[PDB]
Amino acid sequence: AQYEDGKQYTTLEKPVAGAPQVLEFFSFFCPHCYQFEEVLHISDNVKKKLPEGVKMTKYHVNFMGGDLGKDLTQAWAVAMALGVEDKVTVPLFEGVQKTQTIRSASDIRDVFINAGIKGEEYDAAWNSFVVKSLVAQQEKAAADVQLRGVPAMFVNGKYQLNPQGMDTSNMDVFVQQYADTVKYLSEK
């Protein structure tokens, strides 16, 4: 077949019931994740190839970066609770990987302050049980598939994108193959 298990995607041995339809995992420490954001805009390009209104979910992971990795999962929970993902994604990626100015939880908070989130609002979210539950939700989704690598995308809890099987001589062709694979998997 044109699309084959092991080429553009793999199939989970144990599918996850009730999973998000399109579920992405990333780390702000992850170099390909930085590219998926700033260079390729994978999430945007997948969204454009899917029907309007499809639920896309994006979660942070703990397993890169030790203490700060977990702080960043909690900060991503704050971003989701406040709805400010689009305001903080690029400065968090650049703070961790480009300028390397993010070395502590306080430095993460600085990114939100600079992006216009009030200190009181950030701190109240950071310490809220709503955010505690969002941290648990991110961990559970990753645990459901023993995730050991990012960037990762899962479709309907059943299929995992396999970017290592896609063309990388051309960045736009790669994005198109990735997005068309998501569309194919979503229609299975």
Ligand SMILES: CCCCOc1ccc2c(CC(=O)O)coc2c1
């Ligand atoms: C999870 C461990 C890493 C393996 O998974 C990959 C392999 C290659 C790529 C490229 C290529 C590009 O666009 O420059 C973008 O993301 C990738 C993820």
